[PDB]
Amino acid sequence: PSQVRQNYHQDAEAAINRQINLELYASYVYLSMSCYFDRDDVALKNFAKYFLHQSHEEREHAEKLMKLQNQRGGRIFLQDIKKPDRDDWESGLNAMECALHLEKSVNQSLLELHKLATDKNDPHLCDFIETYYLSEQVKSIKELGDHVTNLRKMGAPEAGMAEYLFDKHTLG
Amino acid sequence: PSQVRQNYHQDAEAAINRQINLELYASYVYLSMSCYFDRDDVALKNFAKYFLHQSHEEREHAEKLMKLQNQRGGRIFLQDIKKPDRDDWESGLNAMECALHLEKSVNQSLLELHKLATDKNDPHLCDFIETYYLSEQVKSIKELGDHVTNLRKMGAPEAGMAEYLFDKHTLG
Amino acid sequence: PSQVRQNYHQDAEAAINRQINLELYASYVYLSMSCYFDRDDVALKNFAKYFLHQSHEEREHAEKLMKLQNQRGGRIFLQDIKKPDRDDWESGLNAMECALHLEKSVNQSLLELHKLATDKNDPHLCDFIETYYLSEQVKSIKELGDHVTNLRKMGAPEAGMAEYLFDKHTLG
Amino acid sequence: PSQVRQNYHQDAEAAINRQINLELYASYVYLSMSCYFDRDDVALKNFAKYFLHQSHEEREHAEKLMKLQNQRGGRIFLQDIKKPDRDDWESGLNAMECALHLEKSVNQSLLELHKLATDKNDPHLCDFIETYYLSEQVKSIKELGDHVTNLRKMGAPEAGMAEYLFDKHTLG
Ligand SMILES: [Fe+3]
Ligand SMILES: [Zn+2]
Ligand SMILES: [Zn+2]
Ligand SMILES: [Zn+2]
Ligand SMILES: [Zn+2]
| C-alpha neighbours within 13 Å on the C-beta side of residue A147 | 26
Report which DSSP code applies to C82: P
Taking the centre of ligand 5 as the mean of its atom positions, its distance from the CA of residue D80, in whole angstroms, is: 17
Task: Return the bridge partners of C81, or none.
Answer: B81
| Residues C19, C78 contacting (CB under 8 angstroms) | no
Contacts with C161 from chain D: Cβ below 8 Å? 154-155, 159, 161-162, 165
* CA C152 to each of CA A119, C30, D42, D150: distance values in angstroms, whole numbers, following the listed order: 48, 21, 33, 19
Report which DSSP code applies to B87: S
Annotated resolution, angstroms: 1.1
- Give the domain ranges of chain A: 10-167
Q: CB atoms < 10 A from the CB of B83, how many? A: 17
Alpha-carbon span D121 to A34, nearest angstrom: 74
| Residues B78, B21 contacting (CB under 8 angstroms) | yes
Report which DSSP code applies to A4: T
Residue B56: closest CA among C55, A75, C32, D50 = C55
Which amino acid is located at A28 in the chain? Y
Alpha-carbon span C36 to B141, nearest angstrom: 33
Q: Which ligand approaches the C-alpha of residue B129 most closely?
A: 3
Contacts with B35 from chain C: Cβ below 8 Å? 66, 69-70, 76
Residues near A49 by beta carbon (within 8 Å), at least 6 away in sequence: A34, A171
| C-alpha neighbours within 13 Å on the C-beta side of residue C66 | 27
| Residues B114, B126 contacting (CB under 8 angstroms) | yes
| Residues B25, B149 contacting (CB under 8 angstroms) | no
Task: Return the bridge partners of D154, or none.
Answer: none
Rg (CA), chain C: 18
| Residues C55, C30 contacting (CB under 8 angstroms) | yes
Handedness of CA B163, B167, B171, C4 (dihedral sign): positive
Structure determination technique employed: cryo-EM
CB contact under 8 A, D141 and B6: yes
Q: B101-119 burial, b for 16+ CB within 10 Å, e for fewer?
A: ebbeebbebbeebbebbee
| Residues A32, A89 contacting (CB under 8 angstroms) | yes
Contacts with A104 from chain C: Cβ below 8 Å? 6
Optimal mutation site among A134, A135, A139, interface C, most CBs of chain C within 10 A: A134
Which chains sit next to C, with 3 or more Cβ pairs under 8 A? A, B, D
Touching status, chains D and A (3+ beta-carbon pairs under 8 Å): no
Touching status, chains A and C (3+ beta-carbon pairs under 8 Å): yes
CB contact under 8 A, C43 and D146: yes
Alpha-carbon span C90 to C42, nearest angstrom: 9
What CATH topology corresponds to B10-167? Ferritin (1.20.1260)
Report which DSSP code applies to B155: T
| Residues A102, A45 contacting (CB under 8 angstroms) | no
What are phi and psi for residue B81, nearest 5 degrees?
A: -95, 110
Q: CB atoms < 10 A from the CB of D79, how many? A: 11
Residues near D163 by beta carbon (within 8 Å), at least 6 away in sequence: D44, D47, D91, D92, D93, D151, D156, D157
Residue A159: closest CA among C77, B159, B19 = B159
CB contact under 8 A, C4 and A145: yes
Residue D69: closest CA among D134, D23, D137, D115 = D23
**Nearest CA-CA distance, residue C34 and chain D, Å:** 15
The dihedral region occupied by C121, where left means phi > 0, alpha psi between -120 and 50, and beta the remainder, is left
Q: CB atoms < 10 A from the CB of A60, how many? A: 12
Alpha-carbon span A111 to A109, nearest angstrom: 5
Residue B99 C-alpha from the chain's centroid: 8
Residues near C154 by beta carbon (within 8 Å), at least 6 away in sequence: C162, C165, C166
Alpha-carbon span D96 to A149, nearest angstrom: 65
> If DSSP codes are grouped into helix, strand and coil, which group holds residue D122?
coil
